[PDB]
Design a binder for these strands. Structure first.
Lengths: 66, 70, 156, 225, 259, 129, 88
RNA sequence: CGGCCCCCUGGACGAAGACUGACGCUCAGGUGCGAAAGCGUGGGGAGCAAACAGGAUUAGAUACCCUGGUAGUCCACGCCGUAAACGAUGUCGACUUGGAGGUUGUGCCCUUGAGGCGUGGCUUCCGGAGCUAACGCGUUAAGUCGACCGCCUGGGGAGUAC
């Protein structure tokens, strides 16, 4: 039950923070493709986006850090 | 697993919640894993072995199920 | 009318808590001196019983073999497990030139004239089986004609 | 004799799901509707007719027919079919080596008969209560197993089967001895052991009944002849 | 000939996949198993509990016709998913009928809110609606004679996840689950959910528009460990459950049943 | 790479026989066609049919008598690795005359017996039984 | 890889029809250009072994092509090797 | 071969077309790449840790366990050329029943929805015929064949001596 297949997105955006936030943990970790049911191709992209965000301090690497 | 006790929340409940959060995180498990160095080979082996086991559980057992026990 | 030859008898063991339980295997083969052959492999605590069992086995599940006179119709290979066997038709008078278990099967089958070598393993049980297979597969001229949609004179 | 329309109504044309099929049943399959295999009734019917004819012929020479169906849905029905044409049957679990090992099973049959006699004709009664109970239980067991085949005497001259994959042991036994086999063979089943294959739905009850009934009729006809 | 080919496309034309065409004739009844034949490869093992109406006893003898459902084929041997869901489509059609004249009228009787909306029951089935829907104003049916007779006037429906809150009394008055997972959230919002499969540690009740709930084994009852959930509740049944916990991240809404 | 077309054809035929295939198709060649014709004459296949202009496909129609296959055995003898040429006296007898040996001679491809009759030997293509 | 425009240019020059592209000579030219390009890269990056494998393969292919040309038609080959400046 | 970014760069696959026109397959010698450890010169050195030291354990304990700990692991440029370098399965091509997946394209179809019907590439498991000493392999063959190469000929002595 993938979101990105239905939406039909060409590429996942690191700037689209809200969207990312659904796929990240309360502890900051990226959520598995088993749980979200994201398609494999998209999942990787999502992960990459998240990573990018983390570099730009848009998303946090973890809950504890400060 | 950062948590804040809600207004008029019991202590025990809060504790339980915290525990749940911890479990979700898999923090303890992670710690256990990083206690000692696992050779790459060993890591590989476990992963594949585990996978195999899972597969066995899924299919062979299902086949067994079709036939009644008594 | 049926002739029956006990090829081999072998003592086989099973280890148990006490010690070794021994038993006997009898390999026999029976035939009517024409196409019909059948081997039987019987097992029992005593020899004679085992032999009897083998004979009984043989007598059922026989098999027919197309024989051009006293000999085979063409050179035929037969394999089973280790034992791979070649047998070749031969002129009247030559006799059964074949070794061991193989000979016995031939004799009962009512082949009188063969040139037959057992390559590979010569484990009696396997070799007899191989021989049987060879015999079985061997097609006659008439049969071949039938298969091919021709007369016997067309094939020669 | 049996029409195509009737068969269709029954649900003969339906088969098993596509993942459970046997590729040796690819000739008898027509297509796949809703991911479920459809048996070709154009190829089935003539075969069925032929089988029926064969059965009739067998009957005519005083042949013994054995009706096998241990599905438990069509156990009631097969027995009924058997009884209509006063033939023999195995509606509960086929005893491994019923036919191949007849001589042992002949003893069992005899025992059963004896038990029955004791129950009915003797009228002695006066038996220790536990012992009596045990005896009764034994009788029940025997009846369930060998009730249809108690009057068979020897081996049957033909073997009608409701499912080939389910009764493979029986089929195998029939092949070893050389008894003609008349199997109803769904898409999942193997037709190679069967002599007179009948491509049709083993599972559906109405279809099974239909299959039985025609066969019974043919047997009766043969007997009459 | 092509008689059969044409007959095949004919029979394709005169059936469909869902429980739509009321076709299976009940051809054997035995407690506790009904069985039909809707022109499928095999007969359904129907429960008796998809067919007794509103007080416990059976309603349909031999020959009677209800459609069932489909799109799932062969678990080993057999054919269907149950006809009772069939019924849900009919209910949906009646609810939809409202749209035409902007007013669906039956009877709705709603005594109380498990999760903030009185429960309304139509015919055999009972549904849960959000808190406003029960009353047109602030009237509140707590002062009304218990389990009172009105109809239902619809207040709110969730359109994906099936929750419908309907309007008792006042006759005169006339990606997708997981972003905004804050609706049934706040601590204990009770829900009505059908269980799906009980995995010997769990029960898997999950209804609210493409989510997954567990109610695992610890609550379920008021005994902890010796319980074995298959004994204690059901298979395929709409029950009392509420959230107790949502993680919108590792989609594990952990519902409960001891409440 | 494809090195021996005749051999390949033979293999295909064998596989068809094994697997109870009605007809066996392959890319056509003149030699192959000739072989097919020979087989037909000798009665191991039902019929052969070449079809196409640019890249034609030879289609043999295999034969089955009483369930089992007709072509009991079919081996190449000459092969690109190691060629076999026989003189008319040295020509073989497959299955003691019951089978045939396809032999390519100066006067076209023919069965061994035919070759013998003619009074000429050549390249031994395949044994068929 | 070789840029599209460059490739096109190469094709036009060596190819008779300019739509042809698959002409042996054209192919050789294409290979050669690529090789030349990669020389610069490999001067810089001596440990890039994986990449160098591809280059080697390309070279081999080119050689093969040349050989083919030689047996078929000598004059053409000679011309080609004058144009490209291939020692052999 | 695993954070993220950029620069240079090799291969794979699909979609249609268009072109070249057997240019192919395999390969003794030859050439290159080739884990870890190891070597050389120059850097670096957190953690880990051969060696080493102490503390235990023990009959002993030149080990396992504990506390420390140096080469090394890291980088640059050279050398080494071996591993259960394994799928213990040479490379290339053709042919022979099926099922359940994964991954990555792509054509059509009302995408009426996460779908429906195909068609390509790579890939995991199960299993048929056949094969196999059996175990098992089974369209990714260990089946049926062809082309080329490599290699084996009882165990030890020995992959050692010269």
């Amino acid at each position: 039950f993938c979101r990105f297949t239905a939406e039909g997105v060409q590429e996942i955006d690191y700037k689209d923070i809200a969207t990312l936030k659904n796929y990240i943990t309360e502890s900051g970790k990226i959520v598995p493709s088993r749980i979200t049911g994201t398609r494999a191709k998209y999942q990787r992209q999502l992960a990459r986006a998240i990573k990018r965000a983390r570099y730009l301090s848009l998303l946090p690497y973890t809950d504890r850090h400060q | 697993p950062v948590i804040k006790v809600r207004e008029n929340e019991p202590f025990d409940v809060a504790l339980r919640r915290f525990k749940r959060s911890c479990e979700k995180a898999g923090v303890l498990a992670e710690v256990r894993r990083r206690e000692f160095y696992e050779k790459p080979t060993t890591e590989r082996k476990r992963a594949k072995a585990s996978a195999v086991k899972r597969h066995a559980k899924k299919l062979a057992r299902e086949n067994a199920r079709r036939t009644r026990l008594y | 009318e049926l002739q029956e030859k006990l090829i081999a008898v072998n003592r086989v063991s099973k280890t148990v808590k006490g010690g070794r339980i021994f038993s006997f295997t009898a390999l026999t083969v029976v035939g009517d001196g024409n196409g019909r052959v059948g081997f039987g492999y019987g097992k029992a605590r005593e020899v004679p019983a085992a032999i009897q069992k083998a004979m009984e086995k043989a007598r059922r599940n026989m098999i027919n073999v197309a024989l051009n006179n006293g000999t085979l119709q063409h050179p035929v290979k037969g394999v089973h497990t280790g034992s791979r066997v070649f047998m070749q038709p031969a002129s009247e008078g030559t006799g059964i030139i074949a070794g061991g278990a193989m000979r016995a099967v031939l004799e009962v089958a009512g082949v009188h004239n063969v040139l037959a070598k057992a390559y590979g393993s010569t484990n009696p049980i396997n070799v007899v089986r191989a021989t049987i297979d060879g015999l079985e597969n061997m097609n006659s001229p008439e049969m071949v004609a039938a298969k091919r949609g021709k007369s016997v004179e067309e094939i020669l | 004799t049996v029409s195509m329309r009737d068969m269709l109504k029954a649900g003969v044309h339906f088969g098993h799901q596509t993942r459970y099929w046997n590729p040796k049943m690819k000739p008898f399959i027509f297509g796949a509707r809703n991911k479920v295999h459809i048996i070709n009734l154009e190829k089935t019917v003539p075969m069925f007719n032929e089988a029926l004819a064969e059965l009739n012929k067998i009957a005519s020479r005083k042949g013994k027919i054995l009706f096998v169906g241990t599905k438990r849905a069509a156990s009631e029905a097969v027995k009924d079919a058997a009884l209509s044409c006063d033939q023999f049957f195995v509606n509960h679990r086929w005893l491994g080596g019923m036919l191949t090992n007849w001589k042992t099973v002949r003893q069992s049959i005899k025992r059963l008969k004896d038990l029955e006699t004791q129950s009915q004709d003797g009228t002695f009664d006066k038996l220790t209560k536990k012992e009596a109970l045990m005896r009764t239980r034994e009788l029940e067991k025997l009846e369930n197993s060998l009730g249809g085949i108690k009057d068979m005497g020897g081996l049957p001259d033909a073997l009608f089967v409701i499912d080939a994959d389910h009764e493979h042991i029986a089929i195998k036994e029939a092949n070893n001895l050389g008894i003609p086999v008349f199997a109803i063979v769904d898409t999942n089943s193997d037709p190679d052991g069967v002599d007179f294959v009948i491509p049709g739905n083993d599972d559906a009850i109405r279809a099974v009944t239909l299959y039985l009934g025609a066969v019974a009729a043919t047997v009766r006809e043969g007997r009459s002849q | 000939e092509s008689f059969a080919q044409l007959f095949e496309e004919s029979l394709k034309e005169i059936e469909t996949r869902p429980g739509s065409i009321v076709r299976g004739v009940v051809v054997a009844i035995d407690k506790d198993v009904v069985l039909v034949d809707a022109g499928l490869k095999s007969e359904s093992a129907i429960p008796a509990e998809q067919f007794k109406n509103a007080q416990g006893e059976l309603e349909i003898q031999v020959g009677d016709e209800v459609d069932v459902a489909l799109d799932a084929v062969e678990d080993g041997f057999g054919e269907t998913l149950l006809s009772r869901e069939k019924a849900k489509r009919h209910e949906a059609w009646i609810t939809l009928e409202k749209a035409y004249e902007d007013a669906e009228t039956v009877t709705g009787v709603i005594n109380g809110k498990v999760k903030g909306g009185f429960t309304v029951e139509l015919n055999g089935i009972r549904a849960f609606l959000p808190g406003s829907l029960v009353d047109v104003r602030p009237v509140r049916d707590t002062l009304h004679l218990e389990g009172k007779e009105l109809e239902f006037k619809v207040i709110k429906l969730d359109q994906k996840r099936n929750n419908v809150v309907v309007s008792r009394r006042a006759v005169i008055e006339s990606e997708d689950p997981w972003v905004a997972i804050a609706k049934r959230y706040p601590e204990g919002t009770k829900l009505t959910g059908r269980v799906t499969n009980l995995t010997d540690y769990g029960c898997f009740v999950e209804i609210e528009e493409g989510v997954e709930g567990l109610v695992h084994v610890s609550e379920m009852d008021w005994t902890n460990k010796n319980i074995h959930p298959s004994k204690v509740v059901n298979v395929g049944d709409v029950v009392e459950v509420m959230v107790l916990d949502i993680d919108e991240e590792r989609r594990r809404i952990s519902l409960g049943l001891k409440q | 790479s494809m090195q021996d077309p005749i051999a390949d054809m033979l293999t295909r035929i064998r596989n068809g026989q094994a697997a109870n295939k009605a007809a066996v198709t392959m890319p056509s060649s003149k030699l192959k066609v000739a072989i097919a014709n020979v087989l037909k004459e000798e009665g191991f296949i039902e019929d052969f049919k070449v079809e196409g202009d640019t890249k034609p496909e030879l289609e043999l129609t295999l034969k089955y008598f009483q369930g089992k296959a007709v072509v009991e055995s079919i081996q190449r003898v000459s092969r690109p690795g190691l060629r076999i040429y026989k003189r008319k006296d040295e020509l073989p007898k497959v299955m003691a005359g019951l089978g045939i040996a396809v032999v390519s001679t100066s006067k076209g491809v023919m069965t061994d017996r035919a070759a013998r009759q003619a009074g000429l030997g050549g390249e031994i293509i395949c044994y068929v039984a | 890889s070789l840029s599209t425009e460059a490739t096109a240019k190469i094709v036009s020059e060596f190819g008779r029809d300019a739509n042809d592209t698959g002409s042996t000579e054209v192919q050789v030219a294409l290979l050669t250009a690529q090789i030349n390009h990669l020389q610069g890269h490999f001067a810089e990056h001596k440990k890039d072994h994986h990449s160098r494998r591809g280059l080697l393969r390309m070279v081999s292919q080119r050689r093969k092509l040349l050989d083919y040309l030689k047996r078929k038609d000598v004059a053409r080959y000679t011309q080609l090797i004058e144009r490209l400046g291939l020692r052999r």
